[model samples]
Target: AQYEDGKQYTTLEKPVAGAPQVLEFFSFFCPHCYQFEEVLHISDNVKKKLPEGVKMTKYHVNFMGGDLGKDLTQAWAVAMALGVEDKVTVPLFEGVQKTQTIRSASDIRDVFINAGIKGEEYDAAWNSFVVKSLVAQQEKAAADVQLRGVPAMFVNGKYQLNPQGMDTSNMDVFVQQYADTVKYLSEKK
Candidate 1:
Protein backbone atom coordinates (compact mmCIF):
# COMPACT_ATOMS: atom_id res chain seq x y z
CA ALA A 1 0.00 0.00 0.00
CA GLN A 2 3.01 2.28 -0.19
CA TYR A 3 2.35 2.72 -3.88
CA GLU A 4 1.50 6.39 -3.80
CA ASP A 5 3.96 9.12 -4.64
CA GLY A 6 6.10 10.25 -1.71
CA LYS A 7 5.71 6.84 -0.18
CA GLN A 8 7.62 4.34 -2.33
CA TYR A 9 8.88 7.00 -4.76
CA THR A 10 9.28 10.69 -5.35
CA THR A 11 7.94 12.06 -8.62
CA LEU A 12 9.79 14.44 -10.90
CA GLU A 13 8.22 17.76 -11.82
CA LYS A 14 9.10 17.29 -15.45
CA PRO A 15 9.84 13.71 -16.34
CA VAL A 16 12.56 12.66 -18.76
CA ALA A 17 11.12 12.45 -22.26
CA GLY A 18 11.33 9.17 -24.16
CA ALA A 19 10.15 5.60 -24.06
CA PRO A 20 9.45 4.17 -20.65
CA GLN A 21 12.74 3.82 -18.79
CA VAL A 22 14.31 2.10 -15.82
CA LEU A 23 17.55 3.91 -15.11
CA GLU A 24 20.07 3.12 -12.43
CA PHE A 25 22.29 5.90 -11.21
CA PHE A 26 25.36 4.00 -10.16
CA SER A 27 29.16 4.04 -10.02
CA PHE A 28 31.52 1.17 -10.53
CA PHE A 29 33.61 2.57 -7.72
CA CYS A 30 30.60 2.59 -5.39
CA PRO A 31 30.66 -0.29 -2.89
CA HIS A 32 26.90 -0.37 -2.29
CA CYS A 33 26.25 -0.49 -6.01
CA TYR A 34 28.73 -3.35 -6.20
CA GLN A 35 26.89 -5.27 -3.50
CA PHE A 36 23.54 -4.59 -5.17
CA GLU A 37 24.79 -5.93 -8.45
CA GLU A 38 27.25 -8.66 -7.51
CA VAL A 39 26.52 -9.84 -3.97
CA LEU A 40 22.75 -9.39 -3.79
CA HIS A 41 22.20 -9.67 -7.56
CA ILE A 42 19.15 -7.47 -7.09
CA SER A 43 19.80 -5.59 -10.30
CA ASP A 44 20.28 -8.79 -12.25
CA ASN A 45 16.93 -10.13 -11.13
CA VAL A 46 15.15 -6.81 -11.65
CA LYS A 47 16.40 -6.68 -15.21
CA LYS A 48 15.07 -10.15 -15.85
CA LYS A 49 11.65 -9.31 -14.49
CA LEU A 50 11.01 -5.87 -16.04
CA PRO A 51 8.18 -5.70 -18.59
CA GLU A 52 8.92 -6.81 -22.15
CA GLY A 53 9.63 -3.40 -23.65
CA VAL A 54 11.13 -1.78 -20.59
CA LYS A 55 14.93 -1.99 -20.30
CA MET A 56 17.04 -1.34 -17.25
CA THR A 57 19.83 1.08 -18.04
CA LYS A 58 22.78 2.21 -15.97
CA TYR A 59 24.20 5.72 -15.79
CA HIS A 60 27.56 5.77 -14.03
CA VAL A 61 27.95 8.93 -11.98
CA ASN A 62 31.03 11.14 -12.24
CA PHE A 63 31.43 11.83 -8.53
CA MET A 64 32.71 8.46 -7.35
CA GLY A 65 36.32 8.63 -8.52
CA GLY A 66 37.06 12.31 -8.00
CA ASP A 67 38.88 13.22 -11.24
CA LEU A 68 38.85 9.70 -12.60
CA GLY A 69 35.06 9.52 -12.83
CA LYS A 70 34.99 10.58 -16.47
CA ASP A 71 37.42 7.88 -17.50
CA LEU A 72 35.57 5.15 -15.60
CA THR A 73 32.28 6.33 -17.07
CA GLN A 74 33.99 6.24 -20.46
CA ALA A 75 34.98 2.63 -19.82
CA TRP A 76 31.35 1.90 -18.95
CA ALA A 77 30.28 3.27 -22.34
CA VAL A 78 33.11 1.46 -24.11
CA ALA A 79 32.20 -1.96 -22.75
CA MET A 80 28.54 -1.29 -23.45
CA ALA A 81 29.09 -0.40 -27.10
CA LEU A 82 31.51 -3.27 -27.52
CA GLY A 83 28.78 -5.64 -26.33
CA VAL A 84 30.81 -6.87 -23.35
CA GLU A 85 29.01 -5.08 -20.51
CA ASP A 86 28.07 -8.35 -18.83
CA LYS A 87 31.67 -9.51 -18.91
CA VAL A 88 33.19 -6.25 -17.74
CA THR A 89 30.83 -4.60 -15.24
CA VAL A 90 31.67 -6.60 -12.11
CA PRO A 91 35.35 -7.02 -12.98
CA LEU A 92 35.65 -3.29 -13.45
CA PHE A 93 34.23 -2.83 -9.96
CA GLU A 94 36.62 -5.36 -8.49
CA GLY A 95 39.57 -3.67 -10.09
CA VAL A 96 38.51 -0.20 -9.09
CA GLN A 97 36.97 -0.94 -5.70
CA LYS A 98 38.11 -4.33 -4.44
CA THR A 99 41.74 -4.63 -5.46
CA GLN A 100 42.56 -0.94 -6.08
CA THR A 101 44.14 -1.87 -9.37
CA ILE A 102 42.88 0.65 -11.91
CA ARG A 103 45.09 3.70 -12.27
CA SER A 104 44.97 4.99 -15.83
CA ALA A 105 43.09 4.73 -19.09
CA SER A 106 45.42 1.90 -20.00
CA ASP A 107 44.29 0.05 -16.89
CA ILE A 108 40.63 0.58 -17.78
CA ARG A 109 41.37 -0.51 -21.32
CA ASP A 110 42.90 -3.68 -19.96
CA VAL A 111 39.58 -4.59 -18.34
CA PHE A 112 37.90 -4.56 -21.72
CA ILE A 113 40.87 -6.38 -23.25
CA ASN A 114 40.52 -9.15 -20.70
CA ALA A 115 36.84 -9.33 -21.53
CA GLY A 116 37.78 -10.21 -25.13
CA ILE A 117 37.39 -6.71 -26.60
CA LYS A 118 40.22 -5.72 -28.89
CA GLY A 119 42.46 -2.75 -28.17
CA GLU A 120 41.37 -1.17 -31.42
CA GLU A 121 37.72 -1.81 -30.66
CA TYR A 122 38.03 -0.21 -27.26
CA ASP A 123 39.65 2.84 -28.78
CA ALA A 124 36.96 3.07 -31.43
CA ALA A 125 34.10 3.03 -28.96
CA TRP A 126 35.95 5.27 -26.54
CA ASN A 127 36.32 7.79 -29.36
CA SER A 128 33.00 7.27 -31.08
CA PHE A 129 30.73 10.30 -31.25
CA VAL A 130 27.74 8.55 -29.67
CA VAL A 131 29.64 7.02 -26.78
CA LYS A 132 31.37 10.27 -25.95
CA SER A 133 28.05 12.08 -26.11
CA LEU A 134 26.51 9.40 -23.92
CA VAL A 135 29.30 9.84 -21.37
CA ALA A 136 28.66 13.57 -21.23
CA GLN A 137 24.91 13.05 -20.97
CA GLN A 138 25.31 10.69 -18.04
CA GLU A 139 27.52 13.18 -16.24
CA LYS A 140 25.04 16.01 -16.64
CA ALA A 141 22.08 13.80 -15.83
CA ALA A 142 23.45 12.84 -12.41
CA ALA A 143 24.19 16.45 -11.70
CA ASP A 144 20.70 17.46 -12.81
CA VAL A 145 19.27 14.96 -10.38
CA GLN A 146 21.22 16.76 -7.64
CA LEU A 147 22.28 13.31 -6.68
CA ARG A 148 24.28 13.09 -3.48
CA GLY A 149 24.27 9.32 -3.28
CA VAL A 150 24.39 6.24 -5.37
CA PRO A 151 22.81 2.80 -6.06
CA ALA A 152 19.63 4.69 -6.80
CA MET A 153 16.85 3.68 -9.18
CA PHE A 154 14.32 5.54 -11.34
CA VAL A 155 11.40 4.41 -13.43
CA ASN A 156 9.95 6.18 -16.47
CA GLY A 157 12.68 8.70 -15.78
CA LYS A 158 10.59 10.29 -13.04
CA TYR A 159 9.77 7.89 -10.23
CA GLN A 160 12.76 7.61 -7.92
CA LEU A 161 12.35 4.34 -6.08
CA ASN A 162 12.42 4.23 -2.30
CA PRO A 163 13.59 0.74 -1.40
CA GLN A 164 12.84 1.33 2.28
CA GLY A 165 9.19 0.54 1.61
CA MET A 166 10.01 -2.90 0.19
CA ASP A 167 10.25 -6.17 2.11
CA THR A 168 13.99 -6.55 2.20
CA SER A 169 13.77 -9.44 4.65
CA ASN A 170 12.91 -11.61 1.65
CA MET A 171 15.27 -10.97 -1.23
CA ASP A 172 12.84 -12.54 -3.64
CA VAL A 173 10.00 -10.32 -2.51
CA PHE A 174 12.22 -7.27 -2.58
CA VAL A 175 13.40 -7.93 -6.12
CA GLN A 176 9.92 -8.68 -7.42
CA GLN A 177 8.50 -5.50 -5.92
CA TYR A 178 11.41 -3.58 -7.38
CA ALA A 179 10.66 -4.87 -10.85
CA ASP A 180 6.94 -4.55 -10.42
CA THR A 181 7.30 -0.90 -9.53
CA VAL A 182 9.12 -0.31 -12.78
CA LYS A 183 6.47 -2.19 -14.70
CA TYR A 184 3.63 -0.41 -12.96
CA LEU A 185 5.07 3.05 -13.45
CA SER A 186 6.26 2.42 -16.98
CA GLU A 187 2.70 1.65 -17.95
CA LYS A 188 1.11 4.42 -15.93
CA LYS A 189 -0.36 7.10 -18.17
Candidate 2:
Protein backbone atom coordinates (compact mmCIF):
# COMPACT_ATOMS: atom_id res chain seq x y z
CA ALA A 1 0.00 0.00 0.00
CA GLN A 2 3.02 2.21 0.45
CA TYR A 3 6.09 2.76 -1.71
CA GLU A 4 9.16 4.90 -1.34
CA ASP A 5 12.19 5.48 -3.51
CA GLY A 6 14.21 2.73 -1.87
CA LYS A 7 11.60 0.49 -0.32
CA GLN A 8 9.71 -2.36 -1.90
CA TYR A 9 5.92 -2.26 -2.06
CA THR A 10 4.11 -3.57 0.97
CA THR A 11 0.49 -4.33 0.32
CA LEU A 12 -2.06 -6.30 2.29
CA GLU A 13 -2.79 -8.50 -0.68
CA LYS A 14 -0.52 -9.90 -3.31
CA PRO A 15 -1.25 -8.58 -6.75
CA VAL A 16 -3.05 -10.80 -9.23
CA ALA A 17 -0.52 -12.86 -11.13
CA GLY A 18 1.14 -11.19 -14.10
CA ALA A 19 -0.89 -8.05 -13.42
CA PRO A 20 0.75 -4.66 -13.70
CA GLN A 21 -0.27 -3.49 -10.24
CA VAL A 22 -0.75 0.26 -10.10
CA LEU A 23 -1.22 1.94 -6.73
CA GLU A 24 -2.60 5.43 -7.19
CA PHE A 25 -1.90 7.42 -4.10
CA PHE A 26 -4.32 10.35 -3.76
CA SER A 27 -6.48 12.58 -1.58
CA PHE A 28 -9.86 14.03 -2.52
CA PHE A 29 -9.37 17.44 -0.91
CA CYS A 30 -6.09 18.27 -2.57
CA PRO A 31 -6.41 20.62 -5.51
CA HIS A 32 -3.48 18.92 -7.22
CA CYS A 33 -5.26 15.66 -6.74
CA TYR A 34 -8.30 17.05 -8.52
CA GLN A 35 -6.22 17.95 -11.53
CA PHE A 36 -4.34 14.70 -11.43
CA GLU A 37 -7.61 12.84 -11.67
CA GLU A 38 -7.98 13.93 -15.27
CA VAL A 39 -4.41 13.04 -16.07
CA LEU A 40 -4.66 9.70 -14.32
CA HIS A 41 -7.80 8.85 -16.18
CA ILE A 42 -5.73 9.00 -19.31
CA SER A 43 -3.12 6.81 -17.69
CA ASP A 44 -5.86 4.34 -16.80
CA ASN A 45 -6.71 4.25 -20.45
CA VAL A 46 -3.12 3.32 -21.11
CA LYS A 47 -3.47 0.49 -18.62
CA LYS A 48 -6.62 -0.72 -20.29
CA LYS A 49 -4.73 -0.80 -23.57
CA LEU A 50 -2.28 -3.25 -22.06
CA PRO A 51 -2.60 -7.00 -22.14
CA GLU A 52 -4.57 -8.81 -19.44
CA GLY A 53 -3.72 -8.82 -15.71
CA VAL A 54 -3.02 -5.10 -15.37
CA LYS A 55 -4.80 -3.69 -12.32
CA MET A 56 -4.94 -0.24 -10.79
CA THR A 57 -5.54 -0.11 -7.07
CA LYS A 58 -6.17 3.32 -5.62
CA TYR A 59 -4.77 4.22 -2.25
CA HIS A 60 -6.62 7.21 -0.85
CA VAL A 61 -4.51 9.26 1.51
CA ASN A 62 -6.47 10.87 4.37
CA PHE A 63 -4.14 13.53 5.81
CA MET A 64 -4.86 16.20 3.25
CA GLY A 65 -6.45 19.67 3.19
CA GLY A 66 -9.91 19.30 4.77
CA ASP A 67 -12.31 17.01 6.54
CA LEU A 68 -13.20 15.93 3.03
CA GLY A 69 -9.96 13.98 2.94
CA LYS A 70 -11.27 11.75 5.69
CA ASP A 71 -14.74 11.77 4.20
CA LEU A 72 -13.49 10.70 0.78
CA THR A 73 -11.83 7.65 2.27
CA GLN A 74 -15.12 6.61 3.82
CA ALA A 75 -16.90 7.47 0.59
CA TRP A 76 -14.53 5.20 -1.30
CA ALA A 77 -15.41 2.46 1.14
CA VAL A 78 -19.08 2.92 0.44
CA ALA A 79 -18.56 2.99 -3.28
CA MET A 80 -16.49 -0.18 -3.15
CA ALA A 81 -19.12 -1.88 -1.04
CA LEU A 82 -21.79 -0.98 -3.56
CA GLY A 83 -19.68 -2.81 -6.14
CA VAL A 84 -19.67 0.40 -8.08
CA GLU A 85 -16.33 2.05 -7.37
CA ASP A 86 -15.54 2.96 -10.97
CA LYS A 87 -19.02 4.40 -11.33
CA VAL A 88 -18.63 6.94 -8.55
CA THR A 89 -14.90 7.62 -8.32
CA VAL A 90 -14.61 10.00 -11.25
CA PRO A 91 -17.92 11.74 -10.61
CA LEU A 92 -17.03 12.26 -7.00
CA PHE A 93 -13.75 13.78 -8.10
CA GLU A 94 -15.48 16.05 -10.60
CA GLY A 95 -18.22 17.03 -8.16
CA VAL A 96 -15.80 18.08 -5.46
CA GLN A 97 -13.65 19.97 -7.92
CA LYS A 98 -16.28 21.75 -10.04
CA THR A 99 -18.87 22.56 -7.37
CA GLN A 100 -18.59 25.23 -4.75
CA THR A 101 -20.57 23.08 -2.37
CA ILE A 102 -18.52 21.78 0.51
CA ARG A 103 -17.58 18.11 0.32
CA SER A 104 -19.23 16.01 3.01
CA ALA A 105 -20.92 12.70 3.53
CA SER A 106 -24.15 14.06 2.11
CA ASP A 107 -22.35 15.73 -0.76
CA ILE A 108 -20.60 12.50 -1.67
CA ARG A 109 -23.95 10.77 -1.45
CA ASP A 110 -25.16 13.15 -4.09
CA VAL A 111 -22.20 12.21 -6.30
CA PHE A 112 -23.08 8.55 -5.87
CA ILE A 113 -26.65 9.30 -6.85
CA ASN A 114 -25.55 11.29 -9.87
CA ALA A 115 -23.46 8.30 -10.88
CA GLY A 116 -26.68 6.21 -10.88
CA ILE A 117 -26.26 4.46 -7.59
CA LYS A 118 -29.41 4.82 -5.49
CA GLY A 119 -29.27 6.87 -2.32
CA GLU A 120 -30.69 4.01 -0.28
CA GLU A 121 -28.02 1.69 -1.59
CA TYR A 122 -25.43 4.30 -0.77
CA ASP A 123 -26.62 4.44 2.81
CA ALA A 124 -26.59 0.69 3.23
CA ALA A 125 -23.27 0.25 1.45
CA TRP A 126 -21.68 2.96 3.52
CA ASN A 127 -22.45 0.94 6.62
CA SER A 128 -21.28 -2.40 5.29
CA PHE A 129 -18.37 -4.38 6.73
CA VAL A 130 -16.62 -3.99 3.41
CA VAL A 131 -16.45 -0.27 4.05
CA LYS A 132 -14.90 -0.87 7.46
CA SER A 133 -12.26 -3.11 5.99
CA LEU A 134 -11.45 -0.52 3.38
CA VAL A 135 -11.02 2.09 6.08
CA ALA A 136 -8.53 -0.09 7.83
CA GLN A 137 -6.67 -0.60 4.56
CA GLN A 138 -6.51 3.11 3.90
CA GLU A 139 -5.34 3.78 7.41
CA LYS A 140 -2.63 1.21 7.12
CA ALA A 141 -1.43 2.64 3.82
CA ALA A 142 -1.39 6.22 5.07
CA ALA A 143 0.60 5.17 8.09
CA ASP A 144 3.13 3.32 5.96
CA VAL A 145 3.68 6.06 3.41
CA GLN A 146 3.85 8.85 6.00
CA LEU A 147 3.22 11.29 3.21
CA ARG A 148 2.78 15.02 3.66
CA GLY A 149 0.81 15.73 0.50
CA VAL A 150 -1.62 14.32 -2.04
CA PRO A 151 -1.62 13.13 -5.67
CA ALA A 152 1.32 10.85 -5.15
CA MET A 153 1.48 7.42 -6.81
CA PHE A 154 3.49 4.23 -6.51
CA VAL A 155 3.68 1.70 -9.31
CA ASN A 156 4.54 -1.73 -8.02
CA GLY A 157 6.01 0.06 -4.98
CA LYS A 158 8.94 1.52 -6.87
CA TYR A 159 8.40 5.02 -8.25
CA GLN A 160 7.08 8.35 -6.90
CA LEU A 161 6.78 11.62 -8.76
CA ASN A 162 9.54 14.15 -8.46
CA PRO A 163 7.46 16.12 -5.97
CA GLN A 164 9.62 19.20 -5.61
CA GLY A 165 11.07 18.98 -9.09
CA MET A 166 7.92 19.63 -11.08
CA ASP A 167 6.56 22.96 -12.31
CA THR A 168 3.03 23.62 -11.15
CA SER A 169 1.77 24.42 -14.62
CA ASN A 170 3.23 21.21 -16.01
CA MET A 171 2.01 18.90 -13.26
CA ASP A 172 -0.15 16.89 -15.59
CA VAL A 173 2.71 16.23 -17.97
CA PHE A 174 4.90 15.19 -15.10
CA VAL A 175 2.20 12.86 -13.83
CA GLN A 176 1.94 11.11 -17.15
CA GLN A 177 5.69 10.91 -17.28
CA TYR A 178 5.59 9.21 -13.93
CA ALA A 179 3.11 6.72 -15.24
CA ASP A 180 5.33 6.05 -18.22
CA THR A 181 8.18 5.40 -15.88
CA VAL A 182 6.06 2.82 -14.16
CA LYS A 183 5.12 1.32 -17.45
CA TYR A 184 8.76 1.02 -18.34
CA LEU A 185 9.48 -0.68 -15.07
CA SER A 186 6.65 -3.13 -15.52
CA GLU A 187 7.82 -4.03 -18.98
CA LYS A 188 11.41 -4.48 -17.84
CA LYS A 189 10.40 -6.62 -14.89
Best by TM-score: 1
Q: Write the per-residue lDDT of candidate 2 for residues 1-189, one digit (tens) a residue.
A: 232433332232333333225666776666777666665464575475445777766767777746877888888877666678778766776776767464567877888888888878888778888788988877776555555666665555544444454344765575555555566555545
- Model 2 clash pairs? 1-10, 19-53
Model 1, position 3, has a per-residue lDDT of: 79
**Can you write out model 1's per-residue Cα lDDT over 1-189, one digit (the tens) per residue?**
647898778898766766237778888878878878877787777777765655677878877787677788888877666767789987788898898898888888888888888888888888998898878777777765677889888777677888776778877777788777766776678
Task: Give the Cα lDDT of each candidate.
Answer: 0.78, 0.64
- Compared to the true structure, candidate 1 yields what TM-score? 0.88
Segments in model 1 whose C-alpha atoms lie over 4 Å from true places? none
Ten contiguous residues with the weakest lDDT in model 1: 13-22
Best by lDDT: 1
TM-score of each: 0.88, 0.74
Off by over 4 Å in 2: 1-20, 39-42, 45-50, 163-176
